[PDB]
Design a protein around this ligand. Structure first.
Ligand SMILES: CCCCCCCCCCCCCCCCCC(=O)OC[C@H](COP(=O)([O-])OCC(O)COP(=O)([O-])OC[C@@H](COC(=O)CCCCCCCCCCCCCCCCC)OC(=O)CCCCCCCCCCCCCCCCC)OC(=O)CCCCCCCCCCCCCCCCC
Ligand SMILES: CCCCCCCCCCCCCCCCCC(=O)OC[C@H](COP(=O)([O-])OCC(O)COP(=O)([O-])OC[C@@H](COC(=O)CCCCCCCCCCCCCCCCC)OC(=O)CCCCCCCCCCCCCCCCC)OC(=O)CCCCCCCCCCCCCCCCC
Ligand SMILES: CCCCCCCCCCCCCCCCCC(=O)OC[C@H](COP(=O)([O-])OCC[N+](C)(C)C)OC(=O)CCCCCCCCCCCCCCCCC
Ligand SMILES: CCCCCCCCCCCCCCCCCC(=O)OC[C@H](COP(=O)(O)OCCN)OC(=O)CCCCCCCCCCCCCCCCC
Ligand SMILES: CCCCCCCCCCCCCCCCCC(=O)OC[C@H](COP(=O)(O)OCCN)OC(=O)CCCCCCCCCCCCCCCCC
Ligand SMILES: CCCCCCCCCCCCCCCCCC(=O)OC[C@H](COP(=O)(O)OCCN)OC(=O)CCCCCCCCCCCCCCCCC
Ligand SMILES: Nc1nc2c(ncn2[C@H]2C[C@H](O)[C@@H](COP(=O)(O)OP(=O)(O)OP(=O)(O)O)O2)c(=O)[nH]1
Ligand SMILES: [Mg+2]
Lengths: 63, 459, 120, 320, 99, 345, 53, 48, 52, 19
């Protein structure tokens, strides 16, 4: 086919690999920041549920 | 690259679906055609490397190794055809499957553009060689040879895996071209020295140093002829290829970190040539000669000169061809006499004239003869080493003298002299094994005629 | 690590957001390899039971290949959903916290002085 | 394997299909004393199933085409060669004895499978409980050695207590000169070269060990020749026998079920006969073993599983 | 000792097939394997492959580099330019660090 | 036996880990562990030999002591916080006692001494049920408390389990003891990756289970107990040899078998968390594991050990091998490396 | 199926054709910078769809 | 009969054969239908 | 791991007695009902490190 | 020559439960 086909294919391959490397580094930094301070969707450790707290009036008023 | 890999993958269903009287013929013919197909990536007009895929790539360094592997598969089939004639058909097809899988995995290893995929295919090639050596070896020590080979390779390769994952976590990609372009200098710390050692010692085990080399003579003695062929012609060069690939990201500290291995290589090539002089086993002699030539390759890659890299590539291809030829000749004598003792068959030039001619040409290739790529590679390695330091010429000269001595000692003690007339069972010759010698030697002549192909990356 | 994300319905194989993603093309190397594994499973089963390796059990081999392709397709769609939602969460976090991920400006090879290490 | 836990749950109870003549009757005696005809007549007029004495070719006759295989496929015993020359340089006497023990074990497993599956009683000739008499005669005559005896005893300990003893043990006592005269009148040239000391050794092993050790777990019907050579008084004794001892009384449907599974899986039956104890009279070696195995697989009807052999039939090869 | 086959003697292969070619015991498969090895190994891969490699043009830009070097040398000679300037990159587009 | 008690015992064996992994109360996790132990004991002591009795006794006292320590940790947590789950602010002493007791339940070193003893003297299918199914419920509890674990104690237990498992499997010649030491090494890997990624220890657990299910199935086919017994497999079942060798290599972690994937991805995550020393030591002892696997391969596949006379009768008879279970798991445990991004989650 | 018998001789040629097809599919897969490199970047010609296929 | 004892499978287990063939056909049909529904839903959700 | 068949099926086998301030038998309290209620209502929705 | 295969010695070195 000629040298231009291999040239442009190499450029496309390099762009794909560079974007993948950038995204991998971004993923590492995002995971580290989330686990350091959990504020995104990931590393959300559980907590006792609100929906099983009895809010009805008790036998004792001081509750 | 897929147009080469996929026919070799379809070789296996051909092997298992062929009739038992047509299996060898079909597989040999189609593997020859696959080598002819694998000749198509020598079409390198531009300086740009042929990147076929996002995971497969070509190279002036990778291309001769791929072509040599694809050429060597039918040669292994021809060599291993005779010593499997009294065997079960399932075992024969399994042996052919082992050889074909070796060819597939080695082509993928040389064409791989990612270091982690290179590592995966590296150990994938580690498997069927172990199976071949242990399952079809002749003597008792094949199990010890397999253990030595396997665990030398694995203890080498585990720090390589740690280093590769470290590099991937640092730079993000572990792709060869991205690393080659945005390579980063190292700040010369002890961690970087250990990183250099971890990424070098796997390949320094795989092609033999003077230290760890003890697995190579055991594996070569105990292996069958196809196993000796594939080992001595591809796998040491696989270690060298890995060193050339991975040396690019270790720019500032190789120039002092390569000191012990250069000394180890030079003194070890002297000592192993000396062992070849006082060696009583023909396969051991060829194995230690392989250690010496690969020591030359180690020294050239360590000194990292363009002349050194070009000479390393030329010595890689030339040594693969001539070591396979020597192993095939020794195997022909061993199939005659069922013993590898060198002093026992002596006057074979009398009864085997053209086999003696192949012996003479193989030994003239073994020593450096100036119309040969062997001398081309050795001479340019010598030039680069003398540029590195002028005092290396003493070790080079001693090595060349002992190399000529053991090669001519081989010829004189196994071909010339009075014929051991008690050996009745000296069948005249097989057209198969004469063809095997010719298919080893004619590519040496053609590559001597045009050595621009065997020149590697640097020029 | 992604089990605690908001909107995570438990023990759900494919939520409706997965319906927003393009499915596998049904002839892609993952599913072709899964079918090949099913075929090899049938052949190995025949050889272990000491039957003809391919001449026997054609219905068994067909069932093996079909089941492997079926399960592989649905698992592959689930994994595509998981990778897509991981990328979505990462990009959303990047957009939410820009001060922790600065667009670092790289300069050309005309201001930086790379040290030169000669190989004499 | 059609029978299993599911079949037993759906109802295949051995105690449901049992019968007053669902007995295991083992006929025993010396080398030539009327036990082949006696077992035939007892099975004939009790409605049992007659199992003749398990020879070298028992597995060959009960598996495959049913024709006897080669002398290398079916062991390497050669009872004629044992009679011609014991104490050979190769171990032929113990190879023959161990192969006969394994063959008798397979026959006993087949008989138990038949009895537990159909309820019909079985009359065996010289079951596994009366093979150590031959082994001890071989050892005391010096034909084998203590290593062979220990290996046999180990295999017997591994295999024997997993089964059930016969309901009745009939014995035909006959003097050694009478056995010698019957052997000479039979006219077999190999069998004529037997030692009277060897026959007396077999009889002594019988009387000293087999009769009491089986009398403590089942009933014994020692007869003379004149009490025998008349297979009707024996049948009347069997009819009016009382089965009031032994492990056949303390077991139920599920013990029968697990025994039936263990006895219908023939590889589990013969598993402990192939222990890797490397006795040179028994072990073979890789090259001869692989040659014999490949030739046996190249025999007709033996290359694949018995449902799958196109050279002998089996038309529906592609749908099973 | 164990029951082992002895070591077999190796037969003279030319005693029954004097035209033996090294490949297979029966003559027909042997001669066809010889013909297949010679045709596919010498005729179509050692000749056609050699011709293909020989007629690969401008292998790694060697002839192109010859022509381009001749053109550049001729240009710089007839225009009086210093042939092969010492610095590759232009000094005006390189910024050096201060002091 | 008896079908009714078979159903009861096997249902309770199933029900134990299910309750443990599906219950959010630590008390219900503990009663699931108790269910698993008490249900699996009669399956252990079933042949009524002295070795079975000893194995059942050792297993009972070990798991009872470990479960008592677990219940101590649960009660102390309930005293400290009033809840029935370790939420975030429990005592590190309570958490370390939980980890130690669950390690003794799992059987990793230096609490590993009973595991080859119990696995020996027990039939092969019960060894399979133990070494696969009994290790999910304690691992489920460990995954539930994924943070708030002591990484120091985790890494010490992991490294000593991998070291001791490699050495023990190197020494042993009994197949069940070999499988137990393999279990100890792989549990060491899972515990190593536990505080950094629950997905990776789940992946390694699944790979180990699908790798050692057909190994035990192939042992169960010929009732092969020793290295010699598995060595005369070329005469018994010669079609088994390639799959046996490939699964042993996959248990060794050789590429390109899929058993390389768990070690590779665990090493990757530990590189991401900067534990290169632990990762390197673990990889070298995994090479030792591969050595004793390769000696097993030499015995069973690549050479032909001598056989005896009665194997001719064994070749005369016919056999039966489970469909849909052996071949499927063997193929998925050997040739599934290129599906690695799908396998990791 | 007129020839039959030795049907296995189409296996490796089929693999070769499929490999060439897969290489063509990978070339169609990359497709980026069709004329966007600084080196070539030529005009699209009066009768031409793409520079390389 | 060639064999002295009847083999366990001398005739096909037709229930198993029909069940396996029908399961394969049903799984292929369901797979093609759900792939068509998936591509239709994906195109409908984001345009074409 | 932690299966969630109780949340998937909507049942509550053991979820109504996880803590002190949860469904006492007749109408009673657990001596820290208000404090545990305030802590759980604080920690819900932000659980883990932020709740700590 | 003939390929060596393990003899009684090589086969008996793997018994003893300790190795
Ligand atoms: C005859 C047999 C094939 C019949 C095919 C019939 C169906 C059909 O028409 O398929 C066309 C279908 C069309 O696909 P497409 O969407 O057009 O894209 C094709 C590209 O080539 C897609 O190329 P890609 O680059 O996107 O590849 C997809 C990707 C993902 O692909 C995969 O996951 C499948 C990999 C298969 C190999 O591949 C990889 O990542 C390659 C990984 C390589 C390293 C693996 C290391 C482990 C060792 C080797 C594998 C394990 C084997 C057993 C162990 C022993 C090894 C010694 O192409 C394929 O199915 C391609 C694969 C064909 C060969 C399968 C294996 C044999
Ligand atoms: C192809 C490779 C995979 C084959 C799997 C089946 C294996 C088998 O049964 O072979 C026997 C069978 C031939 O047997 P036979 O001659 O008929 O009779 C069997 C004897 O009776 C058997 O006699 P026996 O077994 O009673 O006694 C002999 C015994 C004696 O024992 C021994 O000799 C022991 C041997 C020990 C040493 C070997 C250990 C294991 C080595 C594994 C490989 C390692 C190196 C490879 C690279 C590294 C891998 C990690 O065993 C053997 O000799 C071993 C038999 C099996 C040998 C072949 C093993 C294949 C699997 C492993 C290799 C493939 C995967 C890795 C390579 C991947 C590619 C690079 O093989 C075949 O028929 C091969 C298949 C040919 C047709 C392929 C058609 C493809 C169609 C594709 C389109 C349709 C599907 C579309 C799907 C997608 C839809 C969307
Ligand atoms: C077969 C050859 C064996 C001998 C030679 C093997 C290599 C020898 C030199 C390297 C050290 C040992 C291998 C480490 C592999 C990882 C290297 C690496 O990533 O280095 C960078 C890392 C450092 O990581 P780093 O570079 O990211 O460090 C952070 C640096 N800053 C902060 C500046 C960014 O090195 C290590 O972590 C080394 C720890 C090694 C701990 C384990 C040692 C085990 C025993 C040593 C020998 C093991 C092989 C022989 C076994 C016995 C055989 C008989
Ligand atoms: C690449 C990796 C290889 C790895 C191993 C591969 C093995 C399998 C090989 C398969 C086939 C591939 C062949 C590769 C070599 C091809 C040789 C060839 O034809 O080269 C081209 C050359 C003319 O090309 P040209 O451009 O002029 O050469 C460079 C000039 N600047 O052509 C010629 O000059 C003509 C050559 C053929 C004519 C006959 C030559 C006879 C030479 C006699 C030499 C006698 C002395 C030998 C001494 C030996 C001592 C040991
Ligand atoms: C086998 C023979 C081994 C001994 C050969 C003779 C000594 C070689 C010493 C050496 O490698 O010196 C190179 C270098 C010199 O010191 P320098 O360049 O200042 O580096 C400081 C390191 N932080 O020193 C260093 O870089 C120090 C570390 C050298 C490590 C060499 C490789 C490890 C040993 C392999 C065997
Ligand atoms: C045959 C496979 C049959 C599958 C049936 C459906 C299973 C199912 O509901 O899977 C969902 C399950 C839980 O999903 P999730 O809430 O993400 O749990 C986190 C655990 N990693 O997801 C998982 O547990 C993820 C791994 C599933 C593996 C399935 C094959 C084994
Ligand atoms: N060495 C040896 N020979 C045995 C064994 N079992 C049987 N034989 C021999 C003894 C006889 O020569 C031959 C036939 O056995 P029988 O006792 O059945 O003799 P035969 O059928 O001639 O007489 P019968 O009417 O049955 O009493 O087999 C055994 O375990 N070991
Ligand atoms: Mg008789």
């Amino acid at each position: 086919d000629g040298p231009e086909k291999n040239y442009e294919k190499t450029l496309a391959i390099l762009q794909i690999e560079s974007e993948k490397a950038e995204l991998r580094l971004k993923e590492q930094e995002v995971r580290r920041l989330m686990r350091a301070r959990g504020d995104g969707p990931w590393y959300q450790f559980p907590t006792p549920e609100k929906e099983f707290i009895d809010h009805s009036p008790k036998a004792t008023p001081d509750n | 690259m897929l147009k080469i890999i996929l026919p070799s993958l379809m070789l296996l269903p051909l092997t298992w679906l062929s009739s038992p009287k047509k299996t060898w013929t079909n597989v040999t013919s189609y593997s020859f055609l696959i080598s002819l197909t694998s000749l198509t990536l020598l079409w390198q007009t531009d300086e740009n490397y042929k990147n076929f895929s996002n995971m497969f790539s070509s190279d002036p360094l990778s291309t001769p190794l791929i072509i040599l592997t694809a050429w060597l598969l039918p040669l292994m089939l021809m060599a291993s055809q005779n010593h499997l004639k009294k065997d079960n058909n399932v075992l024969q097809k399994l042996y052919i499957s082992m050889l074909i899988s070796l060819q597939i995995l080695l082509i993928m290893t040389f064409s791989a553009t990612e270091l982690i995929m290179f590592y995966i295919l590296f150990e994938a090639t580690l498997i069927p060689t172990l199976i071949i050596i242990t399952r079809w070896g002749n003597q008792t020590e094949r199990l010890n040879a397999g253990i030595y080979f396997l665990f030398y390779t694995l203890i080498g390769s585990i720090p390589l895996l740690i280093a590769l994952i470290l590099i991937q976590n640092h730079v993000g990609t572990l792709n060869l071209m991205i690393l080659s372009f945005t390579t980063h200098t190292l700040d010369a710390s002890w961690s970087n020295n250990l990183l250099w050692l971890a990424c070098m010692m796997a390949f320094l085990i795989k092609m033999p140093l003077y230290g760890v080399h003890l697995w190579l003579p055991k594996a070569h003695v105990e292996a069958p002829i196809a196993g000796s062929m594939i080992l001595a012609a591809i796998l040491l060069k696989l270690g060298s290829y890995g060193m050339i690939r991975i040396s690019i990201i270790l720019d500032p500290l190789t120039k002092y970190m390569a000191y012990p291995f250069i000394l180890l290589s030079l003194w070890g090539m002297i000592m192993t040539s000396s062992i070849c002089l006082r060696q009583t086993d023909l396969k051991s002699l060829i194995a230690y000669s392989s250690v010496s030539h690969m020591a030359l390759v180690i020294a050239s890659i360590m000194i990292q000169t363009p002349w050194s890299f070009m000479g390393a590539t030329m010595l890689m291809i030339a040594h693969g061809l001539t070591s396979s030829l020597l192993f095939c000749l020794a195997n022909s004598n061993y199939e005659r006499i069922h013993s590898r003792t060198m002093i026992m068959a002596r006057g074979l030039q009398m009864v085997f004239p053209l086999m003696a001619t192949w012996w003479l040409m193989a030994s003239l290739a073994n020593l450096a003869l100036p119309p040969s790529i062997n001398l081309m590679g050795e001479l340019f390695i010598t030039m680069s080493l003398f540029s590195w330091s002028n005092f290396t010429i003493i070790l080079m000269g001693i090595n060349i003298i002992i190399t000529g001595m053991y090669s001519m000692y081989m010829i004189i003690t196994t071909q010339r002299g009075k014929l051991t007339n008690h050996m009745i069972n000296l069948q005249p010759s097989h057209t198969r094994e004469l063809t095997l010698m010719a298919l080893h030697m004619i590519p040496l002549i053609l590559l001597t005629t045009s050595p621009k192909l065997i020149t590697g990356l640097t020029m | 690590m992604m089990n605690g994300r908001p909107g995570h319905e438990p023990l759900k194989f494919l939520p409706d957001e997965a319906r927003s993603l393009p499915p596998p093309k049904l002839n892609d190397p993952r599913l072709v390899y899964m079918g090949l594994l099913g075929y090899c499973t049938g052949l190995m089963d025949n050889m272990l039971r000491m039957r003809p390796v391919m001449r026997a059990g054609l219905h068994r081999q067909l069932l093996f290949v079909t089941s492997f392709v079926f399960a592989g397709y649905f698992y592959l769609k689930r994994q595509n959903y998981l990778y897509a939602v991981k990328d979505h969460d990462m990009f959303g976090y990047i957009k939410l916290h820009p001060e922790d991920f600065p667009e670092k400006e790289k300069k050309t090879y005309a201001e930086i002085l790379e040290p030169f290490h000669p190989v004499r | 394997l059609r029978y299993g836990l599911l079949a037993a749950i759906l109802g295949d109870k051995t105690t449901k299909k049992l019968h007053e003549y669902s007995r295991v009757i083992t006929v025993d005696g010396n080398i030539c004393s009327g036990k082949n005809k006696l077992a035939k007549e007892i099975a004939q007029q009790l409605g049992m199933k007659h199992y003749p004495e398990a020879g070298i070719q028992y597995s060959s006759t009960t598996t495959g085409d049913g024709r006897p295989l080669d002398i290398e496929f079916s062991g390497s015993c050669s009872l004629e060669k044992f009679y011609d020359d014991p104490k050979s340089n190769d171990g032929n006497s113990y190879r023959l004895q161990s192969w006969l023990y394994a063959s008798r074990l397979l026959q006993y497993a087949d008989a138990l499978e038949h009895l537990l599956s159909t309820g019909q009683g079985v009359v065996l000739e010289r079951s596994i409980y009366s093979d150590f008499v031959f082994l001890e005669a071989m050892y005391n005559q010096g034909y084998i050695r203590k290593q062979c005896v220990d290996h046999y005893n180990e295999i017997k300990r591994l295999t024997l207590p997993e089964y059930l003893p016969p309901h009745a043990v009939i014995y035909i006592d006959v003097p050694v000169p009478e056995v010698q005269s019957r052997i000479q009148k039979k006219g077999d040239p190999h069998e004529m070269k037997v030692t009277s000391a060897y026959l007396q050794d077999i009889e002594n092993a019988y009387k000293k060990t087999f009769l009491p050790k089986m009398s403590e777990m089942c009933e014994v019907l020692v007869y003379d020749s004149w009490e025998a050579e008349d297979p009707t008084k024996v049948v009347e004794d069997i009819e009016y026998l009382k089965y009031n001892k032994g492990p056949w009384l303390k077991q139920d449907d599920w013990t029968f079920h697990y025994l039936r599974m263990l006895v219908q899986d023939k590889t589990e039956v013969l598993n402990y006969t192939t222990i890797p104890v490397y006795l040179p009279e028994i072990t073979i070696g890789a090259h001869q073993g692989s040659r014999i195995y490949n030739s046996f697989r190249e025999l007709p009807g033996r290359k694949y599983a018995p449902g799958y052999n196109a050279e002998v039939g089996d038309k529906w090869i592609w749908l099973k | 000792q164990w029951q082992e086959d002895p070591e077999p003697e190796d037969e003279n292969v030319y005693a029954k097939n004097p035209d033996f070619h090294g490949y297979d015991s029966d003559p027909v498969v042997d001669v066809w394997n010889m013909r297949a090895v010679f045709f596919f190994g010498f005729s179509i891969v050692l000749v056609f492959g050699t011709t293909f490699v020989a007629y690969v043009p401008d292998y790694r830009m060697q002839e192109w580099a010859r022509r381009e070097a001749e053109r550049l040398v001729k240009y710089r000679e007839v225009n009086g330019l210093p042939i092969m300037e010492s610095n590759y990159f232009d000094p005006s587009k390189i910024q050096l660090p201060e002091d | 036996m008896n079908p009714i008690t078979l159903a009861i015992i096997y249902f309770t064996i199933f029900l134990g880990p299910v309750i443990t992994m599906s219950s959010t109360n630590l008390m219900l996790m503990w009663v699931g562990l108790e269910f698993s132990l008490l249900a699996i004991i009669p399956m252990l002591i079933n042949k009524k030999n002295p070795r079975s009795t000893e194995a059942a006794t050792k297993y009972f006292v070990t798991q009872a002591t470990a479960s008592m320590i677990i219940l101590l940790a649960i009660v102390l947590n309930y005293k400290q916080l009033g809840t029935w789950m370790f939420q975030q602010q429990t005592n590190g002493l309570i958490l370390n006692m939980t980890l130690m007791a669950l390690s003794m339940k799992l059987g990793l070193a230096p609490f590993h001494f009973w595991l080859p003893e119990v696995t020996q003297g027990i039939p092969l299918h019960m060894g399979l049920i133990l070494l696969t199914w009994q290790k999910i419920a304690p691992l489920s509890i460990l995954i539930q408390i994924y943070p708030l674990l002591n990484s120091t104690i985790i890494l010490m237990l992991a490294i000593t389990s991998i070291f001791m498992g490699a050495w023990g499997g190197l020494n042993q010649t009994q197949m069940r003891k070999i499988m137990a030491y393999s279990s100890i090494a792989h549990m060491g890997w899972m515990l190593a990756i536990l505080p950094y990624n629950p997905s990776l220890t789940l992946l390694n657990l699944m790979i180990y289970i699908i790798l050692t299910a057909p190994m035990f199935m192939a042992l169960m086919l010929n009732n092969s107990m020793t290295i010699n017994s598995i060595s005369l497999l070329w005469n018994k079942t010669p079609a088994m040899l390639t799959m046996i060798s490939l699964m042993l290599l996959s248990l060794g972690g050789l590429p390109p078998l899929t058993g390389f994937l768990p070690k590779w991805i665990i090493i990757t995550e530990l590189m991401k968390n900067n534990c290169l020393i632990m990762a390197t030591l673990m990889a070298m002892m995994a090479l030792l594991n591969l050595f004793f696997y390769t000696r097993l391969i030499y015995s069973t596949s690549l050479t032909m050990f001598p056989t005896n006379n009665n194997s001719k009768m064994m070749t005369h008879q016919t056999k039966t091998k489970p469909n849909l279970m052996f071949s499927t798991l063997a193929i998925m445990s050997t040739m599934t490396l290129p599906l690695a991004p799908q396998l990791i989650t | 199926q007129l020839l039959r018998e030795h049907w296995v001789h189409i296996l490796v040629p089929a693999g070769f054709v499929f490999g060439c097809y897969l290489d063509r599919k990978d070339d169609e897969k990359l497709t980026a910078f069709r004329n966007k490199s600084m080196l070539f970047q030529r005009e699209l010609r009066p009768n031409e769809e793409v520079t390389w296929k | 009969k060639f064999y002295v004892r009847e083999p366990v499978n001398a005739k096909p287990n037709w229930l198993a054969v029909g069940l396996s063939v029908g399961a394969s056909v049903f799984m292929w049909i369901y797979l093609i239908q759900t792939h068509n529904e998936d591509v239709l839903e994906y195109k409908r959700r984001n345009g074409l | 791991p932690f299966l969630d068949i109780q949340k998937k099926l909507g049942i509550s086998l053991d979820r109504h007695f996880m803590f002190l301030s949860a469904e006492q038998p007749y109408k009673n309290a657990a001596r820290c009902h208000a404090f545990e209620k305030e802590w759980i209502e604080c920690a819900h929705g932000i659980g883990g490190t932020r709740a700590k | 020559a003939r390929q060596w295969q393990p003899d009684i010695e090589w086969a008996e070195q793997f018994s003893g439960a300790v190795m």
